[PDB]
Design a protein around this motif. Structure first.
Motif, PDB file in Angstrom:
ATOM      1  N   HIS B 205       0.850  -1.191   0.000  1.00  0.00           N
ATOM      2  CA  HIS B 205       0.000   0.000   0.000  1.00  0.00           C
ATOM      3  C   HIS B 205       0.886   1.242   0.000  1.00  0.00           C
ATOM      4  O   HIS B 205       0.564   2.222   0.681  1.00  0.00           O
ATOM      5  CB  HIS B 205      -0.898   0.212   1.244  1.00  0.00           C
ATOM      6  CG  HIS B 205      -1.129  -0.954   2.172  1.00  0.00           C
ATOM      7  ND1 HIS B 205      -1.031  -2.295   1.839  1.00  0.00           N
ATOM      8  CD2 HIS B 205      -1.458  -0.925   3.489  1.00  0.00           C
ATOM      9  CE1 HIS B 205      -1.285  -3.035   2.905  1.00  0.00           C
ATOM     10  NE2 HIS B 205      -1.551  -2.226   3.918  1.00  0.00           N
ATOM     11  N   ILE B 206       1.991   1.241  -0.734  1.00  0.00           N
ATOM     12  CA  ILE B 206       3.077   2.161  -0.434  1.00  0.00           C
ATOM     13  C   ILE B 206       3.043   3.346  -1.389  1.00  0.00           C
ATOM     14  O   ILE B 206       2.769   3.209  -2.585  1.00  0.00           O
ATOM     15  CB  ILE B 206       4.442   1.443  -0.453  1.00  0.00           C
ATOM     16  CG1 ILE B 206       4.672   0.710  -1.776  1.00  0.00           C
ATOM     17  CG2 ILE B 206       4.528   0.463   0.709  1.00  0.00           C
ATOM     18  CD1 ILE B 206       5.701   1.367  -2.677  1.00  0.00           C
ATOM     19  N   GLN B 207       3.286   4.531  -0.829  1.00  0.00           N
ATOM     20  CA  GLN B 207       3.405   5.755  -1.606  1.00  0.00           C
ATOM     21  C   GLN B 207       4.721   6.467  -1.327  1.00  0.00           C
ATOM     22  O   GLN B 207       5.480   6.747  -2.260  1.00  0.00           O
ATOM     23  CB  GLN B 207       2.240   6.712  -1.308  1.00  0.00           C
ATOM     24  CG  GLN B 207       0.917   6.052  -0.952  1.00  0.00           C
ATOM     25  CD  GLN B 207      -0.167   7.058  -0.611  1.00  0.00           C
ATOM     26  OE1 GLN B 207      -0.959   7.445  -1.469  1.00  0.00           O
ATOM     27  NE2 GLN B 207      -0.205   7.487   0.646  1.00  0.00           N
ATOM     28  N   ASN B 208       4.995   6.779  -0.058  1.00  0.00           N
ATOM     29  CA  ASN B 208       6.239   7.474   0.272  1.00  0.00           C
ATOM     30  C   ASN B 208       7.472   6.574   0.419  1.00  0.00           C
ATOM     31  O   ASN B 208       8.478   6.863  -0.251  1.00  0.00           O
ATOM     32  CB  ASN B 208       6.045   8.339   1.528  1.00  0.00           C
ATOM     33  CG  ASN B 208       4.696   9.026   1.569  1.00  0.00           C
ATOM     34  OD1 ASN B 208       3.881   8.872   0.663  1.00  0.00           O
ATOM     35  ND2 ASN B 208       4.463   9.810   2.618  1.00  0.00           N
ATOM     36  N   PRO B 209       7.489   5.467   1.253  1.00  0.00           N
ATOM     37  CA  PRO B 209       8.776   4.789   1.487  1.00  0.00           C
ATOM     38  C   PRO B 209       9.127   3.737   0.441  1.00  0.00           C
ATOM     39  O   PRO B 209       9.603   2.643   0.774  1.00  0.00           O
ATOM     40  CB  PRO B 209       8.570   4.155   2.865  1.00  0.00           C
ATOM     41  CG  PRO B 209       7.159   3.738   2.827  1.00  0.00           C
ATOM     42  CD  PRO B 209       6.425   4.807   2.045  1.00  0.00           C
ATOM     43  N   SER B 210       8.956   4.103  -0.834  1.00  0.00           N
ATOM     44  CA  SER B 210       9.004   3.136  -1.928  1.00  0.00           C
ATOM     45  C   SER B 210      10.399   2.555  -2.114  1.00  0.00           C
ATOM     46  O   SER B 210      10.534   1.363  -2.422  1.00  0.00           O
ATOM     47  CB  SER B 210       8.522   3.795  -3.220  1.00  0.00           C
ATOM     48  OG  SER B 210       7.487   4.727  -2.958  1.00  0.00           O
ATOM     49  N   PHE B 211      11.435   3.379  -1.869  1.00  0.00           N
ATOM     50  CA  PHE B 211      12.834   3.015  -2.103  1.00  0.00           C
ATOM     51  C   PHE B 211      13.231   1.763  -1.333  1.00  0.00           C
ATOM     52  O   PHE B 211      13.855   0.847  -1.896  1.00  0.00           O
ATOM     53  CB  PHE B 211      13.747   4.174  -1.703  1.00  0.00           C
ATOM     54  CG  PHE B 211      13.591   5.399  -2.555  1.00  0.00           C
ATOM     55  CD1 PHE B 211      14.229   5.489  -3.782  1.00  0.00           C
ATOM     56  CD2 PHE B 211      12.808   6.462  -2.129  1.00  0.00           C
ATOM     57  CE1 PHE B 211      14.090   6.614  -4.572  1.00  0.00           C
ATOM     58  CE2 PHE B 211      12.663   7.595  -2.915  1.00  0.00           C
ATOM     59  CZ  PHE B 211      13.306   7.669  -4.138  1.00  0.00           C
ATOM     60  N   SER B 212      12.805   1.683  -0.068  1.00  0.00           N
ATOM     61  CA  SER B 212      13.180   0.564   0.790  1.00  0.00           C
ATOM     62  C   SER B 212      12.542  -0.736   0.320  1.00  0.00           C
ATOM     63  O   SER B 212      13.057  -1.824   0.594  1.00  0.00           O
ATOM     64  CB  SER B 212      12.790   0.868   2.235  1.00  0.00           C
ATOM     65  OG  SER B 212      12.808   2.264   2.479  1.00  0.00           O
ATOM     66  N   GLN B 213      11.414  -0.644  -0.385  1.00  0.00           N
ATOM     67  CA  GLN B 213      10.771  -1.854  -0.883  1.00  0.00           C
ATOM     68  C   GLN B 213      11.333  -2.273  -2.239  1.00  0.00           C
ATOM     69  O   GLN B 213      11.578  -3.469  -2.463  1.00  0.00           O
ATOM     70  CB  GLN B 213       9.260  -1.646  -0.940  1.00  0.00           C
ATOM     71  CG  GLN B 213       8.710  -0.968   0.307  1.00  0.00           C
ATOM     72  CD  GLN B 213       9.082  -1.705   1.582  1.00  0.00           C
ATOM     73  OE1 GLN B 213       8.865  -2.911   1.704  1.00  0.00           O
ATOM     74  NE2 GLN B 213       9.669  -0.986   2.530  1.00  0.00           N
ATOM     75  N   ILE B 214      11.566  -1.311  -3.148  1.00  0.00           N
ATOM     76  CA  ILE B 214      12.001  -1.686  -4.497  1.00  0.00           C
ATOM     77  C   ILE B 214      13.415  -2.228  -4.465  1.00  0.00           C
ATOM     78  O   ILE B 214      13.770  -3.046  -5.322  1.00  0.00           O
ATOM     79  CB  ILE B 214      11.936  -0.544  -5.535  1.00  0.00           C
ATOM     80  CG1 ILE B 214      12.379   0.790  -4.950  1.00  0.00           C
ATOM     81  CG2 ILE B 214      10.535  -0.432  -6.118  1.00  0.00           C
ATOM     82  CD1 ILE B 214      12.507   1.898  -5.971  1.00  0.00           C
ATOM     83  N   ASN B 215      14.240  -1.782  -3.499  1.00  0.00           N
ATOM     84  CA  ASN B 215      15.555  -2.394  -3.303  1.00  0.00           C
ATOM     85  C   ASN B 215      15.449  -3.896  -3.064  1.00  0.00           C
ATOM     86  O   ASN B 215      16.200  -4.675  -3.669  1.00  0.00           O
ATOM     87  CB  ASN B 215      16.293  -1.726  -2.142  1.00  0.00           C
ATOM     88  CG  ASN B 215      16.685  -0.293  -2.438  1.00  0.00           C
ATOM     89  OD1 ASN B 215      16.726   0.548  -1.538  1.00  0.00           O
ATOM     90  ND2 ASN B 215      16.983  -0.005  -3.700  1.00  0.00           N
TER      91      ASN B 215
END
Lengths: 81, 420
Positions: B205-215
């Motif tokens: 459900h991500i909008q802001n902390p996207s970087f930590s997930q796509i890594n």
């Protein structure tokens, strides 16, 4: 595929042309003026000939040898061959 | 032989660190580095092996003005590596000139691990396109390691900057770096931010902390693409035989990537092949179609089912693609990894040459051209002006990528008997 003499009797020539081809291309990384282009055209036409002959020979009848055909014929370029 | 990885950029250093974390979870080592006796697997192509019980990953860690590298230090993996290579711009040209002035000592760092191992196969470049600190410098060292060693292989891990329009200097940077990847790398593994962001918003459900997930998504991809090399398969278990099957034309070396578990936070082979061919399980964003596909399987796979499954896609008319050669779709099999908790047992890969990405390229070839008409978005840096006074090297790179687009558009059709 050593008891079935026709497919053996063309795959050996495929193996014979490959050694000549890889030895031929390695001589000159520039242009080929020692009549290597002359042998290149002859080799690609003869390869298309031998490949179509072995394709007719494959089409005993073990599921593996017939099964190999469909991987290369996924594109249907042995469709017109 | 052994493969050396080089990571630069802050984002690149982050994903390299997460990748080594993923492989430390994979391989028979502890998070301090010490060997665990629970373990088949080879730790030689990416890890230097002493008897210091802390097998050091073969990574070259270079940086400019370390900020996130301090956060890399405060970790339990600070005993995994210390090869002492940390050293203290904004554009492609400024970063290129800054890489120009210090080439001797960073190339001494390269010559150090070159002399450290005796067998050498390939260099992986972990790099972000038009990333600032990564751009310019990465293209410079890319030119230098190809010019210095023509007997080795050059692979790149690269993401694509796309934000749907802000950085006004990005099309120049990506244009030049794409020239350098086409002429100074033999194969490029292409990713973009946008499709992974789309899949991440789909699963979570991500909008802001996207970087930590796509890594995490990227690291799962790069571990998966190396499972066939680290664990001994018999097909393309070296880099050279892998890349030798995927290139039908020496201008085309960009590989499409997918992953069959879209979420992990029973199966037969036809199911995962059909799920694999869908564009939503694909990670990279007129008739545009594949030239040749290689798919790699990892899991509990019966051998006769893969033959039936390939026969199934042959009968589906999911092959609505037509290049000019009989070079065809490709299946491969490797094992699922033991020794770790392994959920979603059967998982897939694809490695494919697709021309839809050319649209992505021409968007950059659109944008720069508009800015070339305006002449107010080059930002006129002083080293940029001294490095090229007429700015005709960007025009020449535009000519090269225009020829690349024409060769792509010729490669789409079944008529490539003439050059495009």
């Amino acid at each position: 595929f050593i008891l079935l003499k026709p497919v053996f009797h063309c795959l050996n020539e495929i193996l014979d042309l490959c050694h000549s081809f890889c030895s031929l291309v390695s001589q000159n990384l520039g242009p080929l003026d020692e009549r290597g282009a002359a042998q290149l055209s002859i080799l690609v036409k003869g390869f298309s000939r031998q490949s179509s002959l072995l394709f007719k020979i494959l089409s005993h009848q073990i599921n593996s040898d017939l099964a190999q055909l469909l991987l290369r014929l996924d594109y249907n370029k042995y469709y017109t061959q | 032989r052994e493969i050396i990885t080089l990571q630069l950029g802050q984002c690149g250093n982050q994903i390299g660190f997460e990748f080594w974390k993923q492989l430390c979870a994979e391989h028979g080592i502890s998070p301090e580095g010490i060997v665990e006796e629970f373990a088949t697997d080879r730790k030689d192509v990416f890890f230097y092996q002493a008897d210091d019980e802390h097998y050091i990953p073969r990574a070259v860690l270079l940086d400019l003005e370390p900020r996130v590298i301090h956060s890399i230090l405060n970790s339990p993996y600070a005993k995994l590596y210390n090869p002492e290579n940390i050293y203290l711009g904004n554009n492609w040209a400024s970063g290129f000139s800054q890489g120009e002035k210090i080439h001797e000592d960073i190339f001494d760092i390269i010559d150090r691990e070159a002399d450290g191992s005796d067998s050498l196969e390939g260099f992986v470049l972990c790099h972000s396109i038009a990333g600032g600190t990564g751009s310019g410098l990465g293209s410079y060292l890319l030119e230098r390691l190809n010019d210095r060693y023509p007997k080795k292989l050059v692979q790149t891990y690269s993401v694509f900057p796309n934000q749907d329009e802000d950085v006004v200097v990005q099309p120049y940077n990506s244009l030049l770096t794409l020239k350098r990847l086409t002429q100074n790398a033999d194969c490029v593994v292409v990713l973009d931010n946008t499709a992974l962001n789309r899949i991440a918003t789909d699963r979570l459900h991500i909008q802001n902390p996207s970087f930590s997930q796509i890594n995490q998504l990227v690291s799962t991809i790069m571990s998966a693409s190396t499972t066939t090399l680290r664990y001994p398969g018999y097909m393309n278990n070296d880099l050279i035989g892998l890349i030798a099957s995927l290139i039908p034309t020496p201008r085309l070396h960009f590989l499409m990537t997918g992953y069959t578990p879209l979420t992990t936070d029973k199966t037969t082979v036809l199911d995962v092949m059909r799920r694999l061919l869908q564009p939503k399980n694909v990670m990279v964003s007129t008739n545009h179609c594949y030239i040749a596909i290689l798919n790699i399987i990892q899991g509990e796979v019966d051998p006769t089912q893969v033959h039936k499954s390939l026969q199934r896609i042959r009968e589906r008319k999911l092959a609505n693609f037509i290049p000019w050669g009989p070079a065809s779709i490709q299946v491969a099999l490797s094992r699922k990894s033991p020794y770790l908790p392994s959920a979603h047992r059967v998982s897939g890969l694809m490695m494919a040459n697709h021309t839809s990405i050319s649209s992505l390229f021409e968007r950059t070839c659109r944008q720069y051209d508009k800015l070339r008409k305006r002449e107010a978005f080059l930002e006129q840096f002083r080293k940029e002006d001294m490095f090229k006074d007429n700015f005709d090297e960007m025009d020449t790179s535009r000519e090269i990528v225009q020829q690349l687009i024409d060769e792509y558009h010729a490669a789409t059709r079944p008529d490539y008997i003439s050059w495009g």
